[PDB]
Design a protein around this ligand. Sequence first.
Ligand code: DCP
Ligand code: CA
Lengths: 511, 28, 97, 351
Amino acid sequence: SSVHDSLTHLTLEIHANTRSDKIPDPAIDEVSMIIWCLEEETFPLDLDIAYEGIMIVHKADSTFPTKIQHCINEIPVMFYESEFEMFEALTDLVLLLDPDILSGFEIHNFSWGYIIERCQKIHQFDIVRELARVKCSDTWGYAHSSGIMITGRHMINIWRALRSDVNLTQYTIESAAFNILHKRLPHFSFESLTNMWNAKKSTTELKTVLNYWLSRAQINIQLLRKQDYIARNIEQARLIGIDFHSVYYRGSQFKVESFLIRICKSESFILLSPGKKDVRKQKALECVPLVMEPESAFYKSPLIVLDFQSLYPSIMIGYNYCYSTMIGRVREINLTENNLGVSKFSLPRNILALLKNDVTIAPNGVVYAKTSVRKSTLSKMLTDILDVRVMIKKTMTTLKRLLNNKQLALKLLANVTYGYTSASFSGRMPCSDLADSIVQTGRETLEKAIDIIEKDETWNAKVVYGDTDSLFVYLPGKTAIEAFSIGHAMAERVTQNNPKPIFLKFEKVYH
Amino acid sequence: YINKILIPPLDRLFNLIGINVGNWAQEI
Amino acid sequence: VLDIQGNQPCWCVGSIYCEMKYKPNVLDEVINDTYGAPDLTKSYTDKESDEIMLEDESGRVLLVGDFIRSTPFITGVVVGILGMEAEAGTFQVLDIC
Amino acid sequence: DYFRIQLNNQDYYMSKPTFLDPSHGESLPLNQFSQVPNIRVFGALPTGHQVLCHVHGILPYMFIKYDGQITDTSTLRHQRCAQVHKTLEVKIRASFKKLGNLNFVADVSVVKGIPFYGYHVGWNLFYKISLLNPSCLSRISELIRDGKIFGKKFEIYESHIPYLLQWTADFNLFGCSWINVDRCYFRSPVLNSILDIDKLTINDDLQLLLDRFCDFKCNVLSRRDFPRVGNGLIEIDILPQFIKNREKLQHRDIHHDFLEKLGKPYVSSARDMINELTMQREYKEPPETKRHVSGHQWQSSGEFEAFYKKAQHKTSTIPNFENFIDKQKFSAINTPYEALPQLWPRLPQIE
DNA sequence: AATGATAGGGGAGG
DNA sequence: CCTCCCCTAC
Ligand SMILES: Nc1ccn([C@H]2C[C@H](O)[C@@H](COP(=O)(O)OP(=O)(O)OP(=O)(O)O)O2)c(=O)n1
Ligand SMILES: [Ca+2]
């Protein structure tokens, strides 16, 4: 077909016989079944592999493989005398397909982790060094990600990905399948599975366990596909520019650093790298967001909800707030030594007099250069990402999915951008003054909006609740049909009293 | 279960109106 | 069942395996009175069939032919199939006991 | 017409300097390098064939403040770079437990730049300390910042950015994107015969690509010097000159003076996205006429204005836009994006 | 080994 | 009143 612009995906599952409800331990209980599923939609080269397979240990009596073959009759099954040969065959299969991602459900104490532990502890075989694409500890890795590190290939823990994606009580294969794929799967205890697997007769039981594990393996691909996790992560990586591993393993500051270094490298900018001690000894944050306690009561009349769109990004775009735009705190401006966050510097001789007009003092008290002398870099980044997001949203099946993935990635990047500042702890390039300015001017904008809304006599409305950018205005007995017009009018009035990127949206009402 | 799972949240929601849910539960 | 392999007639005794899916009306009736019954039609559509096997505690073989078609069968019923293997693990049917 | 490899995964390792790697530097050319870093790229061809790529000549670097004066005659800069290189090498060798076979620092060079943490308008001189082992770069930065190396503490620039991120950003690379390269070097037999993959994976398109890019006469490296290390299909070795993803970057130097005050997206990924959307299909968005305040007056604006007037009266000694910054040509000093082409070894041929 | 800020509320236990 | 823990809003 067309060119290959996706990542190959392979999933694996393990069945191990337990011993009277002991949750099979990877040191006493051996592997028996390595049912694996390979994603077909994104796999090129059209090779005869059938995209599916089952591996079963059989010492070899003379009827078990034949019975299994007839009861399956669809997927080829390979039988091995020992689990070491079965592991070697699995390694050969991985080296043949050479998948980009090896995944599974709860891969720490199960299939991938179980195989790794069995190979390392019992057989003294380093399966990790053999499954890599190169011939020749991670507490954070196991905390909220996959702790397995195989060279070349990415390990994806499906349950963690779904936990980060969808919020629901409990996280099991059955619950996820029912709440995502609308499939109900019977669940059998380990003792029962061992009993069916140890029954020489009753082909029905063998077919039952085989279909059990086959469905468990197959449903993983559908779960990752319906949420479109792989494609969304690939699109986000292409947008930000970080590798596929850093999309989910690294933190939010990594993406912001990537954008910043990519933008600044074209403008001959040199980024400062403060130490941990410098960040620890910097001035603490003083400005806090404005939240008002609502009047706890039941509101019969319609309640219009107003919410600013990207309040902080719009603030930084409009007010030109950046690292390269701070001149200094308006109080205590010395020509010898100053203080701005984690750095000290000295102003030139006649800098203030030269730019006495093209500056804008922040609410916190920090002088910022106007756009007429220097356009800030963060404003450039935020306006570019916002323009791209609104363009793709305005344009908006495959193209629709790609546009949705791009929209989500752009929203995530824009939201994480502000978090780069105000990083008092575990911050690699923080700036207390910039974050304080942003929060304070957000508070001022909120107060101005509230005053404008309350001032109008024709709108006998009063603000009852307030958040970082949320306004709850109450219209006592105001026939909600016309409440939409009033809400649109106040949104337009508030918008027309702010710089260009600042915008207010009505978007809903509570009768 | 009744008291310590339903009385607190229903009381938080309905004390704004001005009614005590616990009185309703007392009669049963 | 695994001993019937060759170009010679042979007979064996085993139970009959069939599909026997439920009728949709029964499924609707049991779903409407369970309060949480899943989409049981998915259990029949996922598999997506028309064949008869012979299970005798050692495996199954497909009962192809015409004598086996013109007889209603229910799963779990044992019979005395007497036929000949022709070209695969499929067993022909000539007489039934 | 370009060899295209997707950025699926990346890693780095230390190897001995071959004829495809830099062996010396400009500060201390006499002393060679004990080891050099190499970046491994795990990618797949557009036809679907996995390719392993080794990247040579890419070195991590960090910037520290230049101590000398801007009135150098292009000769004292080299001497100062040599002295600081020797001091760094000695101090790291002593702390980490005749000076030859450099193991930590490759070379030190002087590059211009504009600081980012604050408002700066003029060119500032910086050192470019290129290291050999990127893993210990954080340790070197900590030692320099803590005053263990020199007699005074020095601020560190561009040390929180990892080596892989620097390499990707310098050459205009994005994750899961094509690495458009025109020339490559092949290794031990291209169609690997691990078990049988030299027959199943091969197709017409793969053979056409090999015929277009592989010559088997002056392209395949020697078997003895460069054995395969990848358990996959065809493996290539690349040089920094070969990567043509760069040269599409728009370099601007408008921040060295008040160019803006006198008479297209800034992210190339966004440019690619909008190009794709235009190819898929005009686009417009009518704005709203906003009449803001005269100066957006706030509660504590008067005190701020008074303090600004006091500060302006304090630091003053009539400045003009065209005559504020001093007009030091700084033509000899290399631009940061004009400095990474340095240290690229050669265009060798050892066939 | 890696981690972006701040603000509110409830519940158990001592 | 105190700390500890859960976890949702922005
Ligand atoms: N995880 C978060 C969520 C929000 N905010 C801050 C940034 C916003 O400027 C402000 C408002 O948050 P919103 O939830 O309203 O999101 P936005 O206003 O930024 O965009 P949108 O309105 O489209 O949701 O709160 C933050 O710092 N971190
Ligand atoms: Ca909002």
